[PDB]
Amino acid sequence: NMSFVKETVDKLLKGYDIRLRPDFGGPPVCVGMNIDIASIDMVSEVNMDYTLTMYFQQYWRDKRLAYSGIPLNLTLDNRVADQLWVPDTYFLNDKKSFVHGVTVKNRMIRLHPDGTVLYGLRITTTAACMMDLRRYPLDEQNCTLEIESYGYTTDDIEFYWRGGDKAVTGVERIELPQFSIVEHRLVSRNVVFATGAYPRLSLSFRLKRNIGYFILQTYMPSILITILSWVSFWINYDASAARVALGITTVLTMTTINTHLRETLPKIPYVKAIDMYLMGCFVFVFLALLEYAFVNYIFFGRGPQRIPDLTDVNAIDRWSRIVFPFTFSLFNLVYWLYYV
Amino acid sequence: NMSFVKETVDKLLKGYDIRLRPDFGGPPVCVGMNIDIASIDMVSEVNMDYTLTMYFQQYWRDKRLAYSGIPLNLTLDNRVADQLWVPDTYFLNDKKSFVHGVTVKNRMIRLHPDGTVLYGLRITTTAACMMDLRRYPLDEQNCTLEIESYGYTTDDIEFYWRGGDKAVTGVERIELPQFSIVEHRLVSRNVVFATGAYPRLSLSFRLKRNIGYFILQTYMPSILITILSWVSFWINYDASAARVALGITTVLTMTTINTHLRETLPKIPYVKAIDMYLMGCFVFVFLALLEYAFVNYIFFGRGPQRIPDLTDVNAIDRWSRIVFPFTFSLFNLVYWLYYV
Amino acid sequence: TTVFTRILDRLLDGYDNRLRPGLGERVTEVKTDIFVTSFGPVSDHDMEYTIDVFFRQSWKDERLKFKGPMTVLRLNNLMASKIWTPDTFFHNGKKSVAHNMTMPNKLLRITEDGTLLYTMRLTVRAECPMHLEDFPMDAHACPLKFGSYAYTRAEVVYEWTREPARSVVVAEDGSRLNQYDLLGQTVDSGIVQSSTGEYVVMTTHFHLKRKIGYFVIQTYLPCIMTVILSQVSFWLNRESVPARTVFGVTTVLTMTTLSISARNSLPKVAYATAMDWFIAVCYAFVFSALIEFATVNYFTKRGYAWDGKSVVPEKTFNSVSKIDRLSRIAFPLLFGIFNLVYWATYLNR
Amino acid sequence: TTVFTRILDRLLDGYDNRLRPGLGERVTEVKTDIFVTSFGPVSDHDMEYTIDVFFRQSWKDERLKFKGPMTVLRLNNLMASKIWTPDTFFHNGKKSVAHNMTMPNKLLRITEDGTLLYTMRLTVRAECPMHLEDFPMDAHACPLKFGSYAYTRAEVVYEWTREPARSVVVAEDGSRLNQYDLLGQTVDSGIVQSSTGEYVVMTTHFHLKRKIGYFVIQTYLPCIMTVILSQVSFWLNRESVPARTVFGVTTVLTMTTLSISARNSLPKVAYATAMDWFIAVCYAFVFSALIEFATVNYFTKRGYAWDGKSVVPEKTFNSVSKIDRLSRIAFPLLFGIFNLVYWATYLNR
Amino acid sequence: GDVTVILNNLLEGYDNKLRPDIGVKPTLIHTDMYVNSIGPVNAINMEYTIDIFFAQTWYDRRLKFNSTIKVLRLNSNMVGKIWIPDTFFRNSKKADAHWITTPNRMLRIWNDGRVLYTLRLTIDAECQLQLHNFPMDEHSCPLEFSSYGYPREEIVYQWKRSSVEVGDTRSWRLYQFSFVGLRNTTEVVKTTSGDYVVMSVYFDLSRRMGYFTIQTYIPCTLIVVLSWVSFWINKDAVPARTSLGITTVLTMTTLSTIARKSLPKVSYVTAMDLFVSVCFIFVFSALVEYGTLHYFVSNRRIAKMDSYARIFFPTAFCLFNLVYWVSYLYLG
């Protein structure tokens, strides 16, 4: 029996021209593609890319590989893929990709009696997606994978998603610590370069950044330090040592929070929503300390000489006890409505 | 004319045994070497290595490759190198190296009528050099590139810097972010191992670090904090809150400077010149704060019971106003003379 | 099928890929154009930039002429490795990638007259020397130089496919820069001389300008406000010795915290950048403010401040320090003047 | 050239590299020696060390006997890939490097009687299990074990070329260690048992001791002085409540800054090291200094200090705290006792 | 030699592209595993490193031979000549065999056709860590493998008597975890190209606690206790109590920066985050307590708020610790 399979396979590969595509000179060869996504990781804001591991399958019919007398779908050793024609599929936004090779090259070739070829690869790719992080950490990112044919134009090869919207699976099972995959969708279109028009398949995800991390690490420490800076407004004006120590240490603490976050957070060198909130909180603690310096100067500098009254020391503190909590609430309302 | 060249090249490689060196069984083949240094990058103190990109040219005569009737120097496709004998040149202190392969392998073969072979490679190597950082950042480093034959002993191969001191170019155009190449040197010698004696060429650079960055960021903040702690000697003894707050915050500031410099500077796990200066300044702010506690104890502890007098707090403070600036200047004088 | 198969077999019959087209007769001329799909990240620490391109080269090879119904042989890399192709390399290039996922990203097209079109997809990481003395207000022209590796200009020359400006094209969405603005590219051709001969170099200079808004909100504004806080202590009464001392030292510690944080973002160079001088000057103003109070406190006669009830004729009270009154003008003015000189110097370059 | 080519072509005629020499007749004995050109960095974070070696192996293959003008065939890797070589692998080896610049860094030499000398230049990264409970006063014996992968001891055995001590040689200037001292080496041999049989293992242990000077000046001395500084407050008058309160908290904040910085440099072990215990005890001492003042401040009757002129009648003034007087002795003594016990525990062993 | 004759005969007419019993029955493969070391667990990348000797045994009737020799002990030379199962590791982020000094592979063929194939592997395997109980978190990191292209009708894997063997666990690179035990399972996973027999090994890991107790839990507790010193200071000591209150807040903010030191930026609250945050609230409230006390008593029962704070703050922090440690060390 196994001789008949051996004879059949030898017959198929004898005289096989790997240089010729299926249906050469005729209709373009239709290639169907499915992706099973094993994982997504290393979503990099700094490098503007994400790393994707997937089972990339390609489907097409090669009548040269049709066989009869065997009611089996012949799975062959993956090294037979080198003796067969496979599509020249490439990913346009791919920066660094490899086919896994333990314990062997993670590749599959499965023939079918009608001549259909199932060609599977296990690929980890680092795909580039431009990220707009001006709303970070409340940003939402759309990262794609651009599947295209390099050499063959639309006259020679055609791409489609095998299974329609069900072509890509495993997206719902992905666990990203920092993102939630809101939606994924599939697009089939044609792209024109200077060298011709090529089929393109596009797989796009929508990543929404999880905010719970930044509530505990950024916003709550900043809010609580800002509120502490208002405690000086309820301290007697004569307590210069107390209010100055309270004011300048909150400024130092806000600096400590801001400089710590500059290290742990990704280094994105333009202004983001996270920067505006930290700068806004730093202005409030800066102004709260300037409030006492104004209060001290009014009592001592302009005392013997003899909008709040600006001449009553108690009025300035009582004014600040209302305005500073009120403006900071208004600052948050403007901040969160503009970004959420 | 082009068919004549093809037959000429075919005749040269007919019967050519790649396993046999030129003049096999005879005198050693002389190999002359030129280096065009493209760049030097990533001079790493942590890894004790530097990365060098260069055009590495090798010159030798192979009588098997002599051709006649063609008044031209044949530049063949770089793949012809695989069919020719080339020296087994290696770099002893090379940690990681590669030949650039975009768009093709960056390799040159140029034959000459008298059998001379010009073999070039564009090599990026991370050569290792141990750096003596005990005087860092006021240190000079000497990083070399050892060039040796692996299999052939001095009976089989001979190296020489082709062109004398001109054999290496592009050193004067090197721009290092942290160093400045004082000079470079070419040395030819033999090295003996247990398996025989081998020829060696040595290219060494002398690197002198630039301290302009460390003056503003490393030394001056420590100097200003040390001077700042002397302000305590000009404040009255009974101002305990003022003098202690000044004293202990300068200690905290020196700690902040020292611990953060440890993170930002290269992780060198032994004592360097800079570590002594930071520790020396940390001693001065420690002694300045300790000076007040001595003054406070003399007035309040030994007061009711009834080199300066050691019984007058004003005398101790006035004594400290001179000795601390004087000793710190003396410490700086001894430090800078020792390391410069 | 058979006609195309016979042409493929006949093309390489008697063909020597070790010889460039026209060797010993004429100069092999290569037409080159670049499509930049993404101008990738620029690293100031490594002084390098990444670029993703379609590198297209075209030349004439009379040995590859064919006659048949087809006018172009849309061939793969399998045939391209069998024929002669230019040994083009990037002079300032670093570790670069010729992608081969899932197959070698190369195409070779042969017209019936022997013209070859040879494109490949590359990710080129290239050196970009940087002079960061104006950091973060610096502008750079990152180069991209390429040419033959082994063939002198008497053997292989390079030309741009079209006018040099239009021979390098960047995709509309192909700017992956976070800290820079790509202002455009300058394209030129030249000659370089080496120990091995003269070579043609094709150069593209991508112009970048660093965006300053982040450094304003992360470093410049916090440092300016810290200096203002130090100078605002001049308005406190001179009898608040613990307050003005704590005000002085903690501002110095605040500047130290900001100074260290700023230098972490700065590339590890040895000269002084524009941000270094701003920080160093802001350090001097904060340092001098504490010494200003040290002088003021030295002349404070009385340990009690004004009681808020008694009048001071012109028990007695300390007067307002003349050092304080002058420093209320000199320190804000000198820092204001410095900002005018600093910002005019570096924003006008 | 023809004569020498015929000798080389005759060696591999009817030669099966799938079979070890002496198969079915004897055990293949491989003579091994190592020349350590450089003992590279030891990485605590990876539990590994790098070593650059000339790994030399010698054995007898009677199928490669020859006759000719020469007595030794100084060959290359091109010939070596055609013959049988030992499948030596490093048992604790991580991702190691066989250098290929500019050519494979291997040499093969065949004497006329069939003896083969086979040396390769390698960068061996080997696992070094480190128990850092005594950090930074810890010492390690990093092993370098190697042997055959596929052949048991009944087929292939390894022996040192010379006496085992003299069969591993370190170059005079090879030490690339920044944080360790290479005290010495121990060379041995043995048998390792697996589910697939018994295998010869050749073992070298490199004895390393960590240098402590950097940690003394960066961590121990600043922590000791911070503790001394906290106990210095015991000599301030009890009426200086803001002074001693700020003294207590800022030393605690100073200890926190030192504690966090010290742990950032260590490998990310989740158990307590020696340095962690020293810092923890220092943290407790600084915490206890501020608690001591709280007790002292609780019994301070009067808010004013001694005026400098009135005689204390042993208006009235506060006496010096008995808690302060005891703490001036108890705290320095207990910290000194702890230091003597701490340093004796770790420096001795 | 007769061994050369045997090897040549076995490869004559042998097609390595065809699985043994290709149209007859599934090719049963018996797998072993020797774990050389389990490398560091990388929480940030949600992966761990493992180094194994991977052994696979199967019968190939094309490799039967008749001779006095009963087993052909070969090196990696013949691995590429015969059919080899396409075993890959499903959760492998990155894996590599070893090639120094030669391919670290073994091939033994018995005269009845049984084939033993062994190779050394280093695998970076994905492990999704649930860090809710960090640093008291326990994990069971899997290592899955199966055939890449052969479904269960063609290749079946099966554990041997000793499925997974481990050597000296004390020599492993588990910096932050202690190895607890391992389990091996067998399951069938349905994919778009068929149903595959999947073999899993689970490595139970428990995080070590010693570093976090000294570094975070004790210093954070001492800062909270130091903040209570304010309640025993006279309320007239405005500079002393304000400086103590705000400096403990600054210290607590400094101590909070190491809570998420080596963790991915997850958005749930870990056990370490809950403790540090509560400690921050306690020192925050101690400073707010004095501000309220100072305002009503002087800057205008509340006049006795210090007496209440001397009891309530230690009691609430002791009650928090009682609930915190019971529910994270015993209630899981």
Ligand SMILES: *[C@@H]1O[C@H](CO)[C@@H](O[C@@H]2O[C@H](CO)[C@@H](O[C@@H]3O[C@H](CO[C@H]4O[C@H](CO[C@H]5O[C@H](CO)[C@@H](O)[C@H](O)[C@@H]5O[C@H]5O[C@H](CO)[C@@H](O)[C@H](O)[C@@H]5O)[C@@H](O)[C@H](O[C@H]5O[C@H](CO)[C@@H](O)[C@H](O)[C@@H]5O)[C@@H]4O)[C@@H](O)[C@H](O[C@H]4O[C@H](CO)[C@@H](O)[C@H](O)[C@@H]4O[C@@H]4O[C@H](CO)[C@@H](O)[C@H](O)[C@@H]4O[C@@H]4O[C@H](CO)[C@@H](O)[C@H](O)[C@@H]4O)[C@@H]3O)[C@H](O)[C@H]2NC(C)=O)[C@H](O)[C@H]1NC(C)=O
């Ligand atoms: C895109 O392009 C990239 C390239 O840019 C491409 O990657 C390349 O992929 C190919 C496969 O398609 C790889 O080639 C194979 O590599 C196997 C080993 O891979 C490991 O080692 C690589 C370095 O190879 C050196 O060392 C091995 C032994 O360790 C040696 O065999 C090699 O010749 C080579 O040795 C040279 O260099 C060393 C120094 O390095 C010198 O010391 C030495 O003297 C010599 O000069 C290394 O690069 C690999 O790492 C890469 O890949 C891994 C994944 O695999 C990845 O994780 C890494 O990150 C990294 O990317 C890896 O460590 C090698 O075994 C294969 O050789 C087999 O098979 C080929 C088939 O053509 C055959 O030609 C060989 O002769 C050999 O035959 C086998 O050998 C078996 C083992 O001994 C044996 O069991 C078999 O029986 C058979 O034995 C022979 O059989 C013949 C008859 O067939 C007979 O005549 C003989 O006598 C004998 O019996 C093969 O070379 C290549 O390494 C990859 N390169 C890179 C840079 O990654 C990628 O795939 C492309 N992608 C796409 C989608 O197209």
Ligand SMILES: *[C@@H]1O[C@H](CO)[C@@H](O[C@@H]2O[C@H](CO)[C@@H](O[C@@H]3O[C@H](CO[C@H]4O[C@H](CO)[C@@H](O)[C@H](O[C@H]5O[C@H](CO)[C@@H](O)[C@H](O)[C@@H]5O)[C@@H]4O)[C@@H](O)[C@H](O[C@H]4O[C@H](CO)[C@@H](O)[C@H](O)[C@@H]4O)[C@@H]3O)[C@H](O)[C@H]2NC(C)=O)[C@H](O)[C@H]1NC(C)=O
């Ligand atoms: C992330 O970001 C990317 C980039 O923005 C998003 O990708 C885009 O997604 C949308 C939604 O899925 C895509 O729109 C669809 O495109 C397909 C394919 O269009 C192609 O093929 C058509 C075949 O008939 C062809 O007509 C198209 O030609 C266009 O241009 C010509 C002029 O040149 C014009 O005449 C045509 O009308 C087209 O505009 C093109 O070659 C298309 O079939 C879809 O049509 C459906 O929806 C429209 C809605 O009006 C409806 O009218 C139709 O009847 C039909 O129901 C639709 O247009 C878009 O192509 C994607 N773009 C890219 C660059 O990929 C991605 O969605 C984002 N991800 C997430 C998660 O948000």
Ligand SMILES: CCCCCCCC(=O)OC[C@H](COP(=O)(O)O[C@@H]1[C@H](O)[C@H](O)[C@@H](OP(=O)(O)O)[C@H](OP(=O)(O)O)[C@H]1O)OC(=O)CCCCCCC
């Ligand atoms: C680095 C070292 C610098 C050393 C600088 C040393 C500078 C120096 O020596 O200043 C002294 C003086 C102090 O002025 P200030 O107003 O602070 O002090 C008053 C001054 O001492 C009067 O003389 C006192 O009156 P009297 O006659 O005693 O009744 C008065 O007593 P009272 O009315 O309060 O009771 C004091 O308050 O300052 C200047 O003149 C400012 C010049 C510009 C100084 C600019 C300094 C930056």
Ligand SMILES: CCCCCCCC(=O)OC[C@H](COP(=O)(O)O[C@@H]1[C@H](O)[C@H](O)[C@@H](OP(=O)(O)O)[C@H](OP(=O)(O)O)[C@H]1O)OC(=O)CCCCCCC
């Ligand atoms: C961390 C240590 C915690 C210790 C907590 C200890 C808590 C505890 O019980 O303190 C009580 C007492 C306070 O001593 P201290 O000298 O600080 O307080 C004096 C004491 O109260 C006298 O009784 C007062 O005189 P009188 O009789 O009223 O006229 C005197 O008033 P005045 O003369 O100033 O007007 C007070 O100053 O301490 C000890 O005896 C030392 C014990 C050993 C201390 C060992 C310390 C290591």
Ligand SMILES: *[C@@H]1O[C@H](CO)[C@@H](O[C@@H]2O[C@H](CO)[C@@H](O)[C@H](O)[C@H]2NC(C)=O)[C@H](O)[C@H]1NC(C)=O
């Ligand atoms: C790994 O799998 C094997 C089976 O392949 C398990 O061994 C079985 O254990 C059960 C226990 O009830 C016995 O009934 C079977 O007879 C065993 N089969 C054997 C030995 O072939 C083994 O326990 C598993 N290891 C685990 C779960 O850690």
Ligand SMILES: CCCCCCCCCC
């Ligand atoms: C170096 C510290 C100087 C502190 C101020 C001194 C003022 C002296 C006025 C005569």
Ligand SMILES: CCCCCCCCCC
């Ligand atoms: C009476 C309260 C005094 C302290 C209040 C501090 C927080 C104010 C938030 C509005």
Ligand SMILES: [Cl-]
């Ligand atoms: Cl080291």
Ligand SMILES: [Cl-]
């Ligand atoms: Cl771990």
